[PDB]
C-alpha cells in the first residue's frame, strides 16, 4: 500500500508481473514434471508387470 | 496356429476405407502405430480413451467392454535360431529380426509376432535380406523400439 | 476327489433360511467373509467368537475342536497351470484366477481353491463378469507368506 | 414353429453395441421397453419417431411403408394352456406368465408371446423370481381389448 | 452373364428406406441421377464431392483411387442389335433403346446397359410406352447425348 501510494502504475505493474511470473513458473514446472513422469511410466505401461 | 490365434482378435485399421495395418490387443491393452492413423473397424472398442507414446510410436489404451476379453499374452524370452510370424518366418539372427524381401507390402505396421505357445514378443512398425524396425520387450520389460539404422515404415 | 476334500470341512452359512455363505476352517482359522452374513449351520462351530478383519473382508477365529482338529493344511506355492475347484477348473495366468462365465453365480462365495494335493491356496470372495473367462477376486498367500486380497478391475461380490 | 413365425419381424434393439432386448412390431405399433433404450437394428423404422406412453412402459409409432407383411395380429382370447416363447411356455397359473427357473436371463425383454395358430397375445417387459416358476411382468389385452400392464408384485426388468 | 460384369458395380442408394436409385462407377467417374435422392451405400465410395449436370440429369465425381478393374468401360461404337440388362434384353433400333412390356419400374433407374464383350453402352433414367424406351447414351464422336422419348416419366 505504501509503494502503491508512492507510484501507482509501477506498483501495480510489478505486482502483475510477479503474479504472471509465478503462475508461468508453476505451470512450466508442473508441465515438465508431468512430461517426465509420462516419459518414465510408458516402459512400464506398454509392457505390464515384470 | 497364428492364423487361428490372431483371427477375430487382431483388428485392422481403416485408412480412407482401406487397411493400413492391424491394431494389437495384448495384455488387455490396445495399441497401434502412431505414424499411421485411421479408425479401427469394430465398435464398442473404437470409442475408448487412448493416450499417445511418441518415443516408442505406439498409441496405447485399454479394452473397455471386458477387462481381459481377447487375451493375447506377451513374453520376453527371445531364443534365436528358428521363430515364426504371420506372413513369413521372421529370423532372430544375432540380435536382429531379419526377413526375406519377397514378402511384405505397404500397410504392414502393427503386426504382432507370435511364438510357439502363441504369445507375442514384438510388434513390427517399420523397416534379399531385410531388417525390420520392431518394438520388443527385453528382460526387465523395458519397451524398446529397436531399428536397423536406416528404416522406413511399412 | 475334491468333493471328499470338502466333505464336512467347509460348514456353510444359513441366511436364516437357505444358504448364502461358505465358511471354512484351515489351520485352525475359521475364515468367513463379512459381506455375506447369516447363521452358521453347525452348532459346534457356532458358539465361538470371531475376530474381524475388515479390509480383507474376513472374520477369522480359533477352531473349537479340542485335540484332533480336522483342518486343511495349506502351502503358499503357486504353480501356474492346474487348480481344481468345486464347480470346475480355475486357471492361474500371470497372477490371475479365471473361471468360465457360465458358472459361479451368487451365494457361492467361500468354497476354497484347492490343487492336486488339495492344498488351500485361495478363498473365493467375489469376482468380475469378465467376458467368457470370468476372473474372481480372492485372497492369495505370496511366497513370503503375506496374505493379500487380489481383485480384478471389476468388483462383483459373488 | 415359433422361431419361423417371429423370424424377420422381431428386430432387436441396439445400445452402443451388443443386444439389450428386442423391439416388437405387431400391428401398426413400434413397441419397445423403456427400462433400457437403444437404436433400431433395422432400416425404414429406425428414423420413425416413437410417441410415448409411460404408464404401460411403451412407445408406439406407425409403419406405413411396410404394406402388412411385418405385423402380427392379436386377439384377447386367453385359456390356461401351453404357449410359445423363445424359452418355452408362459403357462397360466391364475392369470400369470410362469416360466421355469432353468431358463430366463437379463437383457432379453421385449419378446412376443405367440399362440398355437401364430398370433401374439402379450409382450414381456421384465420379470420376478418367487416360487416354482418365475413370473414375468407383461403387457396384455383384457377381455374387451384394453391394454393392461400386469406386474407380479416386486419385479425388475429383465 | 450380365450379373457377373455388374456385380458390385451398381451400388444402391437408400431413400432413408427402400431402394431408390442406382449409381454407376465407370470411366473413373461415379454417375448417379438427380431424380433419385438419398444415401448411397459403401461409404468409402460416398466420400467424394459431386458435381451436378441438370441438362444431362447426372451427378459425377471421381473414384477415390480404387479404380483398377472396378471401373467399367464405356463404348460409343455401338452396333444395332442385342444388348443385355438386369431385367433382360434391350433392342437397339435406329437410336432407340427398347425393352418390352412393363419390365421397367419405379426405383429401377440408374441401371447400366452393357453389351457383348461387357462394356457400358447406356445408363437408364426412365421411359414411356407394347414396348418401353429417357436414356443417356453416347454420340458417334463420343459426346454425351440424352435420348428422351416423348412423355417419358422418370422412374
From Swiss-Prot, chains C, D:
Forms an icosahedral capsid with a T=4 symmetry composed of 240 copies of the capsid protein surrounded by a lipid membrane through which penetrate 80 spikes composed of trimers of E1-E2 heterodimers. The capsid protein binds to the viral RNA genome at a site adjacent to a ribosome binding site for viral genome translation following genome release. Possesses a protease activity that results in its autocatalytic cleavage from the nascent structural protein. The very N-terminus plays a role in the particle assembly process. The N-terminus also contains a nuclear localization signal and a supraphysiological nuclear export signal (supraNES), which is an unusually strong NES that mediates host CRM1 binding in the absence of RanGTP and thus can bind CRM1, not only in the nucleus, but also in the cytoplasm. The C-terminus functions as a protease during translation to cleave itself from the translating structural polyprotein. Residues 9-158 form the Peptidase S3 domain. It is found in: Virion; Host cytoplasm; Host cell membrane; Host nucleus. The modification Phosphothreonine is found at residue 10. Residues 1-9 are annotated as: Ribosome-binding. Residues 51-56, 143-147 are annotated as: Interaction with spike glycoprotein E2. This is Capsid protein. It comes from the Viruses. The active site is at 35 (charge relay system), 57 (charge relay system), 109 (charge relay system). Homodimer. Homomultimer. Interacts with host karyopherin KPNA4; this interaction allows the nuclear import of the viral capsid protein. Interacts with spike glycoprotein E2. Interacts with host IRAK1; the interaction leads to inhibition of IRAK1-dependent signaling. Part of a tetrameric complex composed of host CRM1, host importin alpha/beta dimer and the viral capsid; this complex blocks the receptor-mediated transport through the nuclear pore. Interacts with host phosphatase PPP1CA; this interaction dephosphorylates the capsid protein, which increases its ability to bind to the viral genome. The record marks 83, 116 as: Involved in dimerization of the capsid protein. Phosphorylated on serine and threonine residues. The modification Phosphoserine is found at residue 7.
Amino acid at each position: 500500500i505504501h509503494y502503491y501510494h508512492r507510484h501507482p502504475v509501477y506498483t501495480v505493474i510489478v505486482l502483475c508481473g510477479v503474479a504472471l511470473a509465478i503462475l508461468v513458473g508453476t505451470a512450466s514446472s508442473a508441465a515438465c514434471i508431468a512430461k517426465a513422469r509420462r516419459d518414465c511410466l510408458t516402459p512400464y505401461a506398454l509392457a505390464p508387470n515384470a | 496356429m497364428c492364423m487361428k490365434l490372431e483371427s477375430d482378435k487382431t483388428f485392422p485399421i481403416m485408412l480412407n476405407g482401406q487397411v493400413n495395418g492391424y491394431a494389437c490387443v495384448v495384455g488387455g491393452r490396445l495399441m497401434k502405430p502412431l505414424h499411421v492413423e485411421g479408425k479401427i473397424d469394430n465398435e464398442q472398442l473404437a470409442a475408448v480413451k487412448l493416450k499417445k507414446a511418441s518415443m516408442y510410436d505406439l498409441e496405447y489404451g485399454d479394452v473397455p467392454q471386458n477387462m481381459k476379453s481377447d487375451t493375447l499374452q506377451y513374453t520376453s524370452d527371445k531364443p534365436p535360431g528358428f521363430y515364426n510370424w504371420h506372413h513369413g518366418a521372421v529370423q532372430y539372427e544375432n540380435g536382429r529380426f531379419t526377413v526375406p524381401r519377397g514378402v511384405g507390402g505397404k500397410g504392414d505396421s502393427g503386426r504382432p509376432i507370435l511364438d510357439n505357445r502363441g504369445r507375442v514378443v514384438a510388434i513390427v512398425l517399420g523397416g534379399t535380406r531385410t531388417a525390420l524396425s520392431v518394438v520388443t520387450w527385453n528382460q526387465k520389460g523395458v519397451t524398446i523400439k529397436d531399428t536397423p539404422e536406416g528404416s522406413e515404415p511399412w
